[PDB]
C-alpha cells in the first residue's frame with residue numbers, strides 16, 4: 847500500500863480529457879476520506895465522503911480559496927462501503943470535474959478555480975488503504 851496522506855503531483859496541472867484514478871479499500875469503521883485537487887494552497891476541488899455526519903453518509907464537495915471554504919455541494923448518493931475496495935475516477939471536462947465510483951457516475955463539480963493548468967497536486971487523505979493513484983489521457 848501507499849502512504850496516506852498521499853501527495854500526487856499533476857505536472858502542468860489538469861486539462862480536459864485527463865482521467866485521474868484512485869484505487870483503494872475503505873478501512874473498517876472508516877469515518878472520512880478526502881481528495882484535494884490543489885492549486886498551491888488553494889483547494890480547487892475537495893471531494894469528501896463522510897461516513898457518519900449525524901448518522902448519515904454524505905459526500906461533501908467544496909473549494910478553499912485563501913484558506914476559506916466556499917459553498918458546499920452535497921451528494922447523498924453514497925457508493926462507498928467500509929471494508930470494500932473502490933475505484934474513484936475523476937475525469938476533467940471543460941466545465942467540471944466528473945466523478946464516477948466503481949464505474950458508476952456519481953457527481954459533477956463545476957470549475958470554480960479556472961486556471962486548470964495550475965491545479966498541480968492531488969492529495970489523498972483519510973480512512974483508506976491506498977493501492978494506487980495515477981492519471982492518463984483519454
Ligand SMILES: OC[C@H]1O[C@H](Sc2cccc(I)c2)[C@H](O)[C@@H](n2cc(-c3cc(F)c(F)c(F)c3)nn2)[C@H]1O
Pocket residue numbers: 878879880892894906907908915916917918971972973
Ligand atoms: O466545506 C468542506 C469542509 O467542511 C469542513 S470545514 C467547514 C465548517 C463549517 C462550514 C464550512 I462551508 C466548512 C471540514 O472540516 C473540511 N475538512 C475536511 C478535512 C479532511 C481532512 C482529512 F485529513 C481527511 F482525511 C478527510 F477525510 C477530511 N479537512 N478539512 C471540509 O470538508
Ligand SMILES: [Cl-]
Pocket residue numbers: 878894896
Ligand atoms: Cl470530514
